[PDB]
């Protein structure tokens, strides 16, 4: 459905892009979003899809808007409006100044010191999952690795049972790529229905897990409230269950389709960290946004108080104004410009965990299964939303070509 054009929006800026079902999706989701960067498309457009909203299409505008929290507020960060209004996770739904105190607590549970110490378990899980698959000569990569590897690490960190994954993953996905059976509000309340009692249990009897540390945490020296803890823990669950999970499939699809890039990383494994960054740019996957706090003229366009603006993190690094030959993957690229982990005061707190999971996956997969391909006759289908992903990724290889370590 196309929402009626608001009085202040001129026809020449209308580009009816649907972030949940973009028309060019068959080409690949990044390609589908990149239609917004054709030379005839303005820097800032209005779509009548999903209730009506602006979209900034270029890295320069995306970065600027993410820096200017006084005009572009995080209070309502998701489209559609109903989703952004219901969205209340911490720290994301807060602007500075109040936002900042909550970042330190989140860093205690997912930041570099936690990741540094989790490294052995991350390494051991990647190796055991991949070794289990290796002799099979095939896998359904999304379900056999992309999901269980990051999700089991997160559930371990959070002290949550692995048998709870299907329910929590389903709810998470309704917040980013809704199937239509739940509104954002309904998915959020179901997630809170799960979390609220666990938070109370761990405030009564603290453990060492992430939920315990959040639930018993302090924020700038005063106790976190149960409500705040719930709102933080909800966000961490979403980061754990619906970010790296998707990104790994884009990366592995790419490697399946490009033998020369596999061979590069096999022959020069020291390039894997750089490769991770270049893949983060090329297969960037997040797009949320902000709400206008006031009427504001931005790059020659009149924005109105309360208008939503999508500021796709995915697009900055695909912008040819930020990186030449942007759809080309070059592991030797010298200035890899992107906003894949966000920009401004909300810069991703999970990015060190994410990079470790990616780098460990690349190293340990290519050691054991150096040569693999997309399954015969398979067409890989992407899906689009707040976080984009890969619906299924069937891979094959000759288990004669694999090595047990
Ligand atoms: C490839 C993986 C990931 C990507 C691309 C990604 C992307 C992002 C982006 C774009 C933002 C900013 C959103 C905004 O400004 O509205 C963000 C924030 C955040 N991310 Fe990540 N993320 C990833 C992994 C993770 C993981 C694994 C976790 C935790 C387990 C996590 C936790 C967070 C948190 C807590 C914030 C909010 C920071 C704040 O609002 O101050 N992320 N992430
Ligand atoms: C946009 C995000 C990737 C970032 C971390 C999880 C996510 C879906 C959010 O709600 C904030
Ligand atoms: K809100």
Residue numbers in the entry: 10 to 414
The paper states:
Cytochrome P450cam (P450cam) is a thiolate haem-containing monooxygenase that catalyzes the regioselective and stereoselective hydroxylation of (+)-camphor to produce 5-exo-hydroxycamphor. The reaction is initiated by the binding of (+)-camphor to the resting state of the enzyme. Substrate binding changes the spin state of the haem iron from low to high and raises its redox potential (Fe3+/Fe2+ couple) by ∼100 mV, which allows the reduction of the enzyme by an electron-transfer system comprising NADH-putidaredoxin reductases and putidaredoxin. Here, two ferric P450cam structures partially complexed with (+)-camphor were determined by X-­ray crystallography at 1.30–1.35 Å resolution, revealing the structures of the substrate-free and substrate-bound forms.
Crystals of ferric P450cam were grown in crystallization buffer con­taining 1 mM (+)-camphor and the crystals grown were soaked in crystallization buffer saturated with (+)-camphor (∼8 mM). The structure of the unsoaked P450cam shows an active site that is partially occupied by (+)-­camphor and a water molecule liganded to the haem iron and rotamers of Thr101. The water molecule bound to the haem iron is 1.56 Å from the C5 atom of (+)-camphor. Hence, the water does not coexist with (+)-camphor in one protein structure, indicating that the crystals are a mixture of (+)-camphor-bound and (+)-camphor-free forms. It was noted that the electron density arising from the keto group of (+)-­camphor was much higher than that of the bound water, suggesting that the (+)-camphor-bound form is the major component and the water-bound form is the minor component. The two rotamers of the Thr101 side chain also showed unequal electron density; the form with the hydroxy group directed toward the peripheral haem 6-­propionate showed much higher electron density than the form with the hydroxy group directed toward Tyr96. Since the (+)-camphor molecule cannot coexist with the water molecule, 35% occupancy of the water molecule is equivalent to 65% occupancy of the (+)-camphor molecule. Thus, the estimated occupancy of (+)-camphor in the unsoaked crystal is 65–66%.
